[PDB]
Write an enzyme that holds these catalytic residues in place. Structure first.
Site, PDB file in Angstrom:
ATOM      1  N   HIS A 172     -12.347  -6.160  12.216  1.00 35.84           N
ATOM      2  CA  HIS A 172     -11.201  -5.475  11.222  1.00 35.84           C
ATOM      3  C   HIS A 172     -11.056  -4.031  10.949  1.00 35.84           C
ATOM      4  CE1 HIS A 172      -8.277  -6.350   7.816  1.00 35.84           C
ATOM      5  NE2 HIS A 172      -7.860  -7.344   8.531  1.00 35.84           N
ATOM      6  N   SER A 210      -2.282  -7.980   9.141  1.00 35.21           N
ATOM      7  CA  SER A 210      -2.798  -8.248   8.118  1.00 35.21           C
ATOM      8  C   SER A 210      -2.148  -8.923   6.858  1.00 35.21           C
ATOM      9  CB  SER A 210      -4.239  -7.178   7.299  1.00 35.21           C
ATOM     10  OG  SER A 210      -5.211  -7.527   6.793  1.00 35.21           O
ATOM     11  N   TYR A 211      -2.107  -8.311   5.599  1.00 35.56           N
ATOM     12  CA  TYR A 211      -1.282  -8.739   4.719  1.00 35.56           C
ATOM     13  C   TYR A 211       0.041  -8.439   4.957  1.00 35.56           C
ATOM     14  CZ  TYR A 211      -0.166  -9.592  -0.444  1.00 35.56           C
ATOM     15  OH  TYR A 211       0.265 -10.100  -1.558  1.00 35.56           O
ATOM     16  N   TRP A 265     -12.059  -6.230  -1.534  1.00 34.97           N
ATOM     17  CA  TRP A 265     -10.538  -6.123  -1.846  1.00 34.97           C
ATOM     18  C   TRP A 265     -10.033  -5.752  -3.241  1.00 34.97           C
ATOM     19  CZ3 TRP A 265      -5.910  -8.896  -3.443  1.00 34.97           C
ATOM     20  CH2 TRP A 265      -4.726  -8.619  -2.738  1.00 34.97           C
ATOM     21  N   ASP A 307     -13.120 -10.739  14.138  1.00 36.57           N
ATOM     22  CA  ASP A 307     -12.151 -10.538  13.172  1.00 36.57           C
ATOM     23  C   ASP A 307     -12.198 -11.754  12.012  1.00 36.57           C
ATOM     24  OD1 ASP A 307      -9.684  -8.655  11.942  1.00 36.57           O
ATOM     25  OD2 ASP A 307      -8.848 -10.842  11.636  1.00 36.57           O
ATOM     26  N   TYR A 313       0.929  -1.210  -0.032  1.00 40.53           N
ATOM     27  CA  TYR A 313       0.106   0.009  -0.122  1.00 40.53           C
ATOM     28  C   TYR A 313       0.629   1.390   0.157  1.00 40.53           C
ATOM     29  CZ  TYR A 313      -3.282  -3.604   1.425  1.00 40.53           C
ATOM     30  OH  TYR A 313      -4.061  -4.846   1.830  1.00 40.53           O
TER      31      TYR A 313
END
Lengths: 574, 571
Positions: free
Chosen positions: A287, A117-118, A166, A259, A44
């Site tokens: 989340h 997360s990722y 997403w 989550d 990101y």
């Protein structure tokens, strides 16, 4: 030079085994020799630090105390070279990056990782590479089996709102990152924003495999995910779970009761604890909401995500394993959990808890159990009378999702009130009597049912709930099973119409005290949309069918002395 | 695009005490332009406030230097702490020190939000030629008018008690070695923040054992001085703003506690300098655009990257001297509710505004939402009056609006749970055929009477949806002893009729075909404002059992034409 001061260098390039280069930024302290190092991998934009950090740590404290830190753009995005495809390149690219760090004159031979997360999944992909200089990791809200979370699940149904949400986010990113605009860019932006304002409407277009916009911008959406419903060859090669038993690396693990990754986060702790030093932390978060405040339920100010306490714990953990200080973790617990109902934090020695008793609660009652004003009961004793409950399921009118573990469609209200759906005919209800003594439930949760259907394939669902004195009915945990996958996710077979089967449903986990004056309750049905996609009841290839070629089904739940349907609860009594 | 960071460099003031700063400086040939920030919540903790402002590391990569400072008596700085009184002098001495350094080219500016915005107006009045431009967000320049009291003359009790508890918790955690009583104090502070309305219910209000010990200012300055007197005058800045001629970039929000005073600063400086304005639909703690019974869309989320681009162009024009840097940038930009879209304009107030009266009327009593009250552009033909009883032991509760600490994350709230009470009067129009736009400042004019020597009156505007929802927009209050002046008050007499005005701040909304326009009238709104005793004594020193009830009245007709004034736009 001077203790507590540092400097920053931008866009340093790093070569991979095939000739492609990736870009990094370096945060380095004033020092008289080599230092220990920490690494993060991000899709990101490495420049945009404020967007993710409020969900993690105040990490500039590490640099002021003498650590270096490296942040990287992944393959094919922003400042890096190459072409972008999810998951498939990340194991090899991490191996080549760790080798480069150990070659520099400013590194003392000791390395670790952190993130969410990722940025958490990329840490497990690095751990199986076999590089000796990596000493410890810390993955938050993550998974090590991508089929089981977040794209499909343990019951074998597709997570449709997660995939479309997403994908639209990544697409919006590519348009905004360009200097010289393409002629089609302006119109595409308008269509992308229409999906994010209404995710449920976008999931309603049939057939599902027809995506003119998303399929053009990112082929992976159809070519990998939608086209492969079985847990076959394509999925097993990117899975890490089977190799975790052979490692010996320490890990600090975090999760949340509402989550999307919660089931798979807990599984990683159980798999590594016998071979090295592991730690665990669990709060009541979803989340996109870490505040502790919801529309019809409040947990108190002590439940807000504690960023300073988390910064202190992480630093003690690295001082032990990277600097070798043998007494750094003194007075720090092994497991720490937020217990709902009483609403307070509590310490433990292991997970699962050592004094657990798994107890059946049986289904029963006189008269039909349809709606919340019917006659269904729950008890620790077996039912005396033989009976069955019956309903009709129509794919054109499914039961809507409310709270739970949703990600992008209304994902900021986990403990939701269930009263708006209580009077539907396809929702069966069963509950205990008003309680006079308190009852605690903490651990993993599942169910065993006896069922039959008029078609050759269908779905079944189950959900646990807490009923307040003033009328509120608050959700806790849930799960699903698709009938063709009842025995195996790898080799499916169809069923026989009119015959009776015994099946299991995986409902993940929870922690809650039911107080005096409350009731325990269970809901049973055949759908939950758009959390999961809807079954067609035909037995064909679901994702390629039109709405007008699907059909209805008559479904039944059997209960009694020869068919003892029940739910299994983990009871704690001290 | 490379830089370095130096921490804890000490700067001496006129009396000899020293304040601490951190320095973010770029790799360059010679001297550069500079930007300053003054903060009471620890200069190390950048992640806590930055998400409500800008991605400011982009300025540093482009060649600007940045300086961040701990205020007097907190964290790494020397001296003693007390709110507001030292900030005008300390900023003057800090600006002088920067201009003396070899790395500064002679041009300086400022940015920040809330308390970090109030400190910018305090610096502007000092008269230092080197300061070229400022950018204050969600702020004020008259501290009586916002956020401690108001234009109607009642105390904002939830805001005071909430903020004082937050500062107190910081002082305990910042200590090097603990005291014995620290742990017991920490428990009492948490109980206040978990139930703000309970803490405000105690009588006499002036007795605060915990808060008065940790920070004496709470009683000695704020509670003991209810008139707008000499002690308040010495920290106000408003009257000095007109003659400055300094360019300013101003931001605000429709449900923010500071909104009335933010807009007044723009009107004050627009005639002799390059001023700009931006307004969204946010409250102080919720910038998402999502609420419990109302959603505004993804374009309503606070746009941090577009805000970074606008700030950079503003500094390039006034600190670097680039003539055309602001080409194609509008003067005013607003979010219009109802239609839910952004739109550009040439001035505030809007050039083509028509101020239009809507009169009160109806046959039968107007108590409750099922009564007979009406609204119309024509004067009422019959003389009447509505009546109700107000008891201090059972007031009307606050729901949405411009709240700060007590349930402050649901601005546009559904009003259905309170509007069947016997002390709430309701008036509305018929179902509309064509759309109507209201955009600007708002107020009311009423004829009133009472059986007591002092009391309060309140008013609030609302939008009624076809499905049943009743969504709140804007509101205000007036305390009768202050009807003519905030400085020299006088009492009233029982039975007599008075004509009074109520200040309802501002809004921007389109009422669509199928909707209605509605107004609520009453005598309380708690804990947004404190409760009137109805005796005429010293309100904050009285016991609950010493207070009394009152019989209040609203007059309407051709002799006494009560109404609300709406700013209508027709294009």
């Amino acid at each position: 030079m001077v203790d507590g001061n540092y400097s920053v260098a931008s866009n340093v390039m790093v070569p991979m085994r095939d000739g492609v280069r990736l870009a990094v930024d370096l945060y380095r302290p004033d020092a008289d020799g080599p230092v220990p190092v920490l690494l993060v991998r991000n899709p990101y934009d490495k420049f945009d630090v404020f967007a993710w950090s409020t969900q993690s740590t105040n990490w500039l404290e590490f640099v002021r105390d003498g650590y270096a830190v490296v942040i990287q753009d992944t393959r094919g995005l922003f400042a890096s070279e190459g072409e972008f495809v999810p998951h498939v390149d990340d194991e090899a690219d991490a191996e080549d990056t760790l080798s480069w760090i150990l070659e520099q004159a400013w590194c003392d031979g000791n390395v670790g990782m952190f993130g969410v997360s990722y940025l958490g999944v990329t840490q497990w992909q690095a751990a199986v590479s076999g590089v000796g200089g990596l000493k410890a990791i810390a993955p938050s809200m993550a998974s090590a089996d991508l089929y089981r979370a977040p794209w499909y699940g343990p019951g074998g149904a597709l997570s449709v709102e997660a995939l479309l949400g997403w994908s639209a986010l990544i697409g919006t990113g590519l348009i905004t990152s360009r200097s010289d605009a393409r002629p089609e860019d302006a119109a595409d932006f308008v269509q992308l924003a229409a999906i994010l304002n209404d995710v449920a409407g976008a999931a309603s277009v049939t057939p599902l495999a027809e995506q003119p916009l998303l399929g053009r911008l990112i082929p992976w959406v159809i070519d990998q995910v939608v086209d492969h419903p079985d847990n076959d060859e394509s999925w097993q090669s990117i899975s890490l779970f089977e190799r975790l038993g052979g490692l010996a690396t320490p890990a600090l693990i975090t999760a949340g009761w509402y989550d999307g990754f919660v089931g798979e986060s807990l599984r990683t702790f159980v798999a590594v604890k016998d071979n090295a030093d592991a730690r665990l932390v669990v709060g009541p978060w979803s989340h996109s909401n870490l505040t502790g405040r919801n529309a019809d339920r409040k947990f108190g100010i002590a439940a807000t995500y504690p960023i300073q306490e988390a910064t202190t714990m992480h630093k003690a953990f690295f001082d032990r394993h990277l600097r070798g200080e043998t007494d750094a973790l003194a007075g720090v617990p092994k497991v720490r959990l937020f217990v709902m109902g009483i609403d307070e934090w509590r310490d433990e020695t292991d997970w699962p808890l050592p004094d657990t008793a798994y107890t059946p609660f049986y289904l029963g009652g006189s008269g039909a159990a349809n709606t919340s004003t019917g006659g269904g009961t729950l008890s620790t004793s077996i039912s005396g009378t033989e009976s069955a409950d019956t309903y009709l399921y129509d794919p054109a009118d499914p039961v809507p999702s409310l709270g739970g573990t949703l990600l992008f469609h209304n994902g900021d209200n986990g403990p939701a009130d269930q009263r708006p759906i209580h009077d539907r005919d396809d929702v069966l209800c069963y509950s205990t009597e008003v309680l006079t003594d308190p009852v605690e439930v903490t651990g993993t949760v599942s169910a065993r049912l006896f069922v039959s259907s008029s078609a050759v394939d269908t779905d079944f669902t189950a959900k646990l709930v807490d009923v307040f004195p003033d009328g509120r009915a608050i959700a806790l945990c849930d799960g699903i099973v698709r009938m063709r996958y009842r025995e195996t996710l790898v080799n499916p077979t169809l069923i026989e119409a009119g015959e009776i089967y015994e099946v299991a449903i995986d409902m993940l986990a929870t922690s809650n005290v039911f107080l005096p004056g409350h009731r325990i309750m269970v809901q049973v049905s055949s759908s939950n949309f758009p959390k999961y996609d809807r079954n067609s009841n035909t037995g064909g290839v679901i994702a390629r069918e039109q709405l007008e070629e699907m059909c209805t089904a008559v479904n039944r739940i059997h209960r009694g002395p020869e068919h003892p349907s029940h739910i299994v609860l983990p009871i704690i009594k001290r």
